[PDB]
Design a protein around this ligand. Structure first.
Ligand SMILES: [Ca+2]
Length: 223
């Protein structure tokens, strides 16, 4: 995350890391057996990692559970990132506690201006590579739908909101993808894409979970 701060060991207990020999995408724990993340993060043989803060050191509190199944949205579009959502079932239920807890799904969509908390172990620089050891946080507001679009070269659909800072400097970035956007204690979004990171007039775009609650609840029940 570019222009953020250190969250602090387990201050974001719903945040998960998806690992395939090394961290590559983020995720959010929505119940003891299911994580939600981005469609575009799909990989086979994913190891979900709960309770992490320093991803490169074993601190105790870590839980490493394998993905028994990974269900991508059937309408995912890999070229426009529309319906960038994926549900991962854990092979065994996670041991829920103070440092590894689930986040509620939303009951209604969040309106422009609401302040949200974005997080992950992604890149922290506008130019170049600097992957942090510890979990990073950014507080940012939802921008108005008109704002994202004036400021855009790529297709934006109704399943995406956008959040951040048009001035630039503060944004999610590569490696945060699939991570959480929490607003008022509810997971409203999934880190999906942006035109680079932290660039002037190019905010971040996020899957709009509020559109997907039926599909999540239903997929979970029948799997
Ligand atoms: Ca660790």
């Amino acid at each position: 995350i570019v222009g953020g701060y250190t969250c602090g060991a387990n201050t974001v207990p719903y945040q998960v890391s998806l690992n395939s020999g090394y961290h590559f995408c983020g995720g959010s724990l929505i119940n003891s057996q299911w994580v939600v993340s981005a469609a575009h993060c799909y990989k086979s043989g994913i190891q979900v990692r709960l309770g992490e803060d320093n991803i490169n050191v074993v601190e105790g509190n870590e839980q490493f559970i394998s993905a028994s199944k990974s269900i991508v949205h059937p309408s995912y579009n890999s070229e426009t990132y529309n319906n960038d959502i994926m549900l991962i079932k854990l092979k065994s239920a996670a041991s829920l506690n103070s440092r590894v807890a689930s986040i509620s799904l939303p009951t209604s969509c969040a309106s422009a201006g609401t302040q949200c908390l974005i997080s992950g172990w992604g890149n922290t620089k506008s130019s170049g590579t600097s992957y942090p050891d510890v979990l990073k946080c950014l507080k940012a507001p939802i921008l108005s739908d008109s704002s994202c679009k004036s400021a855009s070269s790529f297709i934006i659909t109704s399943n995406m909101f956008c959040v951040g800072y048009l001035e630039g400097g503060k944004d999610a970035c590569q490696g945060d993808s699939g991570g959480p956007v929490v607003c008022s204690g509810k997971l409203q979004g999934i880190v999906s894409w942006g035109e680079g990171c932290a660039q002037k007039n190019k905010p971040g775009f996020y899957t709009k979970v509020c559109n997907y609650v039926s599909w999540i609840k239903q997929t979970i029940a029948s799997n």
